[PDB]
Amino acid sequence: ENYRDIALAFLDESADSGTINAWVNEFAYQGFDPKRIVQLVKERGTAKGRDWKKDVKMMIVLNLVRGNKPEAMMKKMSEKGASIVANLISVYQLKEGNPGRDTITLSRVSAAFVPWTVQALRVLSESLPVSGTTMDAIAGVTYPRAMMHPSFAGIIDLDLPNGAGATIADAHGLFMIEFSKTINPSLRTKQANEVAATFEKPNMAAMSGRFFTREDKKKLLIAVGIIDEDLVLASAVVRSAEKYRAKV
Amino acid sequence: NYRDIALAFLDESADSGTINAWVNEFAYQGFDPKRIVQLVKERGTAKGRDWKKDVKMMIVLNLVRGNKPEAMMKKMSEKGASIVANLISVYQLKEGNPGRDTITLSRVSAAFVPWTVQALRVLSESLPVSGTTMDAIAGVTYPRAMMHPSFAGIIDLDLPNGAGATIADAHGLFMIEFSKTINPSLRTKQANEVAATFEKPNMAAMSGRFFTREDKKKLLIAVGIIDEDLVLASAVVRSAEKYRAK
Amino acid sequence: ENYRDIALAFLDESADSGTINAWVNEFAYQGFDPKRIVQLVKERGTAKGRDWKKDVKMMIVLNLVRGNKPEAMMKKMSEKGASIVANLISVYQLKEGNPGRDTITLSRVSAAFVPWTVQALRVLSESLPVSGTTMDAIAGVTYPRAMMHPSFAGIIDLDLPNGAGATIADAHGLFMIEFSKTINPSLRTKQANEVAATFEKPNMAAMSGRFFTREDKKKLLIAVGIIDEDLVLASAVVRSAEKYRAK
Amino acid sequence: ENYRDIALAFLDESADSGTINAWVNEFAYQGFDPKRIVQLVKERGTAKGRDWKKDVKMMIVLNLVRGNKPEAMMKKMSEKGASIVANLISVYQLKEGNPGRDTITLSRVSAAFVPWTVQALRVLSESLPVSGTTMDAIAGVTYPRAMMHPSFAGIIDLDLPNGAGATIADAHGLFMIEFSKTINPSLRTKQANEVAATFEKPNMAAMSGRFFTREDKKKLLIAVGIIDEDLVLASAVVRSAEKYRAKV
Amino acid sequence: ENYRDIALAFLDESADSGTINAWVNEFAYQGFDPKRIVQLVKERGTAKGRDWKKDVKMMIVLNLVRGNKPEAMMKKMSEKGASIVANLISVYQLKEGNPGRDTITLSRVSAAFVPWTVQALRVLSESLPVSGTTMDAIAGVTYPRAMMHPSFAGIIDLDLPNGAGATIADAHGLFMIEFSKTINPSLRTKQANEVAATFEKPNMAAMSGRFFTREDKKKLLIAVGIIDEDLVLASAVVRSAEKYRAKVG
Amino acid sequence: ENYRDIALAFLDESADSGTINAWVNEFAYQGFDPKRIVQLVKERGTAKGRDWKKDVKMMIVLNLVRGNKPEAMMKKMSEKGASIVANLISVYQLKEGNPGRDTITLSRVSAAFVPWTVQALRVLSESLPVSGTTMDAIAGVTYPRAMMHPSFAGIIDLDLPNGAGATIADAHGLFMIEFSKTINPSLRTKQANEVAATFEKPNMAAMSGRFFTREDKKKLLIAVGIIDEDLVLASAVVRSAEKYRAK
């Protein structure tokens, strides 16, 4: 009954933006820890008699083409390929979807080891669920092969000058709205507004990743062709972003 | 023959006050703010713990992740998911709106609103409905203070000139979008049906006997909704007239 | 030996509207018996050692504010109040909705003991699901507080001169179309035509009630302010009815 | 193995139109015998002290307002009325739905004693499940009160000149598609095509009724206002039929 | 490998249209065996014993008017007629729908003993679910009474010269699209395209029937009035077919 | 600890272009091996009776008309035909659907032995689930009988000049969207967009088949009438493709 004084005295408490924003980044939506993924791949890989660095490449390529269901893709695959996939499931304990944070999935391998994933996309652009030529028709120009995977969202700096990261994020969104339509045909009927909201939460988690620094992401964006040394966005990036803005 | 038993009920003591004493007793009340503060105080100090900081953390956790403690942990940083699990243990956190003595993250923000109303000034862009989003929907920069259902617990409806009704409508401009986000099934519905989905528990917070009419006056002034001369901010009135257009 | 002679002769058979209408009202839709409700409240109240006349008042007030779901309203109510509600559920065996005719619900208590319900509305007009000031905005004038509940339909005489009962019925319909929109938000999207048909069957049952006589209903309408002794409708009633006819 | 020759030999087998039509008269879809209903009402009514001619009226009025479930309607009815209903159930052995042909239901009483049922509808038009004013809104004009019951189908002559009987049948169908929507809300979602066929089998049985002759039905249609002495359809009938044809 | 050379050599492999159609009809969808139906009616009928030739007539007439649900039609029928129906269910073990091939249904009796079914339709044209006058309004002329039942599909030769069998099949389809709309009210809402596909599989089975020969069907089509001795289609048949083609394609 | 550096060290990593595509062709979606099907038909066929080359023909005809459920189609088939079907199930161990890759199904026989399947369609066009005349109505012209089966997708070269393979693929898609609607009536309600995505994965597997060479598929397309010797698409093919693009 006299709890009025207790609640009213919370009007003057520390509402500092330092610890509060420190808590939101702590309570931030995080599907998995990239540091944990690399560790478990390294540990379970070297303790098993394996060249994990090669297996990482194979798991990424496997994920970029077949998806994230290791047990399901084996039933419809060449026995020559289905054999080594069964191996990768055994040694690295592969699971499907997004379960626990210490469980290794094919999508998290591509997200953790993105600097190689961003290079593999440059090659097998026509073997993706959404082909390269398809994105070249949707966009006004030839859509950047680097952005043709959700793992690309883990190397984009939103704190770039002039808000360049927001432009790249929108440019990357042009692919994601089609990638979501393909991997989930139920979203095809929905317009771009509803589709964009189906991934804007886990994708935003990769953008605000504390795994790569602001300078590390700068090197990654330059070396792949999204941006140059003078931090100037490519013509393909800006034109792909303005087409995404025309869908919101 | 049962007419006299029933028809003679015309002269019965329609005592004004005791009838309303039953009405104020039967009023729709999701929870008791006095009970929430007590249980946070008791279970917090009996556990050897700094509850005042935990209140801050529980409010921040609620303002960003929602009201499902067990569900938000599965998709959160282990550094953060650890202390959330702590808050669930000591204060016995539950989800939704169950019993009145069960502490939920939404009730902590509602009970300890004077701090919740200050936190919104900071993490405006981390909310389910971002600050800039409300700045586009409203004609001006929508008051950050109103960007949570807990704001309804500090608004005086008995304000002169029906100013409380204006603030209530201004707060409704956010709630119709907050309901659309936390529940995408209401997105298809127009503003009329969405406004009726919260107008019952929200009205309960407005007619709260927890804060007095004078206590709510101090809270509205210190946060920027109204001034000392009881004059509504330009952002409040313009946000209300846009809600009346729905 | 009974081919056409019996059935074909029913063209010459009488079908006057005097005896027929008495059978329709006899064969009428009846949600519950007001005589049965009062009896069960009286019996179960005095046999349990409590003042039922006070409980009747509390059950009516409880119904006028919270509705007709006793088990649900307790979960969101003050423990001081949720305690005495649990009591009312125990002794009078309260149920929800409109089940059997001998099952006592909060809505039937207000309907049976309407002469007190019609007085309580004069007080708690702003605590109703549809507030008094709300009806004052919808109607051209201050809408009669007496009509602010479906229980009011049980005291209106349709056999009033000049069809005055039809006017009061329409005036009462102005509230019911909004009361149905509030207690059931799914009807909010529907226009007044579809909403009016959602209650025009149980409400018509209360209008043609054989519980109160034509003279008893006359006394009730006068003592509450709907009509005067000269059977002249109040200005608030007629103006509220003409707004309902426009829907 | 020579069974092929046996079936082919049915070309010369006899099939005169007299005996064949004699078999269809045994196989025609008949829910009940109107002659049997009238007899049982007369017998069981006169074998008791009951005035059956008055009870027939009450059973028809009871059916036109409450339906065809005597045991169920009593539980939600005034005790003054529920008392005499219980009586009608006792003496005439009333049942519900469409069971045996020798079992008397409230719907069959209205169908057998239709010349009185067709007159009662003129009075209690606003007490029906489908009100009179409702049919006045659906149809372009004031829909004939006589047609506001499935029992009306038992007095319409399909062998009328210029196919006038087909017009009245369609005009009566405008009410039945709404009557079926009300007594069975599950058919409300269905469009008029599916609803019209839910009754087109028992209704067609009443149309081809050998109970009333072609001349007896002529007298009934004239005396109630559906058609005049020169066999000219009323303006309300034809306009209600053309609105029903706009639903097929 | 050498299996590519092996598989590619199936281009030079023989595939005459004669043996293929024999495999199509051999691997064909078959609801029941007409030979089996006649046998079981003969055996179970004479062992009672029954005048089965008369019972066949009654079962056909019963099917042409009430349908294919013996247990259901009895509940709404005159006791004088419902009695002999109950008998037919007992002796010939009548079932409903299309279950096993050795189970006798009222629809299969009319299909097996079609030469009598095709004659009965000439009489009870106005007692059918789809009346004769109804088909006379839908079609430009008086629609052939012979075609007013799905059993008619069992006597039409598709191998007739000038593709005349395809014309009769389309002419018979004009009735089937309305017969399906009546016996199944859910198909009324659907257009003729979707309705025509609901029966085009069991109906095609009756057309390619090895029960009646190409010549036996010729005698049947002539004796009932669909075609003449010079294999010239009736004016009513062709005009009913061109009206069916204007809904289909 | 410094697992960040490890991830960044994959920037200057040996990312090939040959071996990667070698992994893609290894991980490519493959329902079955056409080489394996022909082998098992040859082995299990000669090891019992038997004229397998005739059985291949019968199994193809059986698949083109009844589908891919050997055990189910027997229950509704002539005993004369159901007998030899039971035989084919015995000797070649026939199963249904798409299980293992070493299990022989009726759909895989038609896909493996497509050069004969592509000739049978020219005859039994009106016995198919989707009749020939039906496709003649959907398309502006007489739709190529050769394309009237999913097995046709195994002989189309996507690496054809002027992107002709993409045109034939779209032309073949005009039939598949109707074939999927018939064999699975649940897809009938769905529009062409959703239906086209239900088969675009196993069908694309047949298009990129390493079984037939680019030159072998050329001979097959010419000899059946889809394309001529000058690699010019038939008028029926291009017009059927532009109608598929309209969906």
Numbering used by the authors:
A (entry chain B), D (entry chain E): 4 to 251
B (entry chain A): 5 to 250
C (entry chain F), F (entry chain C): 4 to 250
E (entry chain D): 4 to 252
Describing publication, verbatim:
Toscana virus is an enveloped negative-strand ribonucleic acid (RNA) virus that belongs to the genus phlebovirus in the Bunyaviridae family. The genome of phleboviruses, like other bunyaviruses, is tightly packed with N into ribonucleoprotein complexes (RNPs). In this study, we have elucidated structures of the hexameric RNA-free (apo) N and of hexameric N in complex with a single-stranded nonameric RNA. As in the RVFV N structure, each N monomer consisted of a core domain comprised of two α-helical lobes (the upper and the lower lobe), and an amino-terminal α-helical arm which was divided by a short linker, hinge II, in α1 and α2.
